[PDB]
A paper describes a structure:
β2-microglobulin (β2m) and its truncated variant ΔΝ6 are co-deposited in amyloid fibrils in the joints, causing the disorder dialysis-related amyloidosis (DRA). We show that the aggregation of each variant in vitro results in fibrils that are polymorphic, which contain different numbers of protofilaments and different numbers of β2m subunits per layer of the amyloid fibril structure. High resolution structures, however, show that this polymorphism arises from the assembly of a common building block that is strikingly homogeneous and monomorphic.
The cryoEM density for D76N-2PFa, however, was of sufficient quality to allow an unambiguous atomic model to be built, although the amount of resolved protein sequence per layer is lower than for the equivalent structures of fibrils of β2m-ΔN6 (i.e. ΔN6-2PFa). Strikingly, protofilament #1 has a similar structure to protofilament #1 in ΔΝ6-2PFa with residues 6 to 90 resolved. The length of ordered polypeptide chain resolved in protofilament #2 is shorter, with only residues 21–83 being sufficiently ordered to build a model. The ΔN6-2PFa and D76N-2PFa structures have a very similar structure. In each, protofilament #1 adopts a “termini up” conformation, whilst protofilament #2 adopts a “termini down” orientation. Notably, this marked difference in dynamics of the termini of β2m-D76N fibrils occurs despite the absence of any obvious perturbation of the amyloid core structure caused by the substitution of Asp76 for Asn, since residue 76 is located within a polar cavity that accommodates either side chain without generating steric hindrances or electrostatic repulsion. Interestingly, the ∆Go analysis suggests that E74 and D76 are still destabilising in this conformation, although this does not include potential stabilisation by water molecules that are not resolved in the structure. This analysis does however predict that the D76N substitution would completely negate the destabilising effect of this residue in the amyloid fold, which may explain why D76N fibrils form faster than the other variants.
Residue numbers in the entry:
A (entry chain C), B (entry chain A), C (entry chain E): 6 to 90
D (entry chain B), E (entry chain D), F (entry chain F): 21 to 83
């Protein structure tokens, strides 16, 4: 019963990693405006500019929150497993 | 019972990784406006510009949230497994 | 019962890692404005500019929050496991 | 008497790359990519048996 | 009497890379990329048996 | 009598990289990237048997 794992690669050249895992709320490049350029305007009343009310990554009610997770968030993962019972 | 894993690649040249995993709420390049350029406007009343109300990645009610996940979020994954019972 | 793990790679070239794991609330490049440039405006009344009310990463009510997680957040993970019962 | 006996390699000239040279009243400029090049490598070899034999005489005369 | 007996390598000239040279009333400039190059490597070898044999005579005369 | 008997290596000239040279009334400038280069390596070798044999005569005369 002989198991042999041999790994000798030759990686020639630089390696670049960027934004390997992006999640959640992340909008970008958004513009909300009213009367950006206005002249000879008599009255401006009851203006309501709203982007959001409440930010809650977890919002639970009477919840049995029971996750069992084994995750690997990375850029370069090397998950090697040998088993010889 | 002999199992041999040999891996010696020659990777010639640079490697580039970008935005390997993107999820969730991420809209971009959005414009909401009213009267961008206006003149000789007497009254502007009851303006309502709304983008969103509530941001909640998890919103549960009387929920039995029980996931069992084994995930691998990455850019380059090397998942090698040898088994010799 | 002989199990041998041999790993002698030759990584030639620099390695760069940036933003390996980004999550949560992180919007960027957002502009909310009213009357950016205005002239000869008599009255400006009842202006309401709101971005958000409450920031709460965890907001629970009568919740049995019981997660069992074994996660690995990194840029370069080397998870090697040998088992020989 | 401009003379070039031997000119080689990367030598570009008289190049103009421009974006919005003379512009006015521009609202947004997002994600502009103005890159001339990435990597400069004269001898880039991989597992190469580089065995050149040369006997060159660079003799350009001017009178 | 401009004379070049042997010119090699990376030598670009007369290059102008510009973005919004003469601009007015600009609101946003986001994520501009103006990079001339990344890496400068004259001899970049990997497992290379570099064995050049050269007997060159660079003799450019001016009278 | 400008004479170059042997010129090599990285020698660029007359390069102008500019962003918003003459600008007015600009609100935001975010994440600008103006990098000429990263690494300067003349001899960058990996496991290389570097064995050059050269007998060169650089003899450029001026009278």
């Amino acid at each position: 019963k002989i198991q042999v794992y041999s790994r000798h690669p030759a990686e020639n050249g630089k390696s670049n990693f960027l934004n390997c895992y992006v999640s959640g709320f992340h909008p970008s490049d958004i513009e909300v405006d009213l009367l950006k350029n206005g002249e000879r305007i008599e009255k401006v009343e009851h203006s309501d500019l709203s982007f959001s009310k409440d930010w809650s990554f977890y919002l639970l009610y009477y919840t049995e929150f029971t996750p069992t997770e084994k995750n690997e968030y990375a850029c370069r993962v090397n998950h090697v497993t040998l088993s010889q019972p």
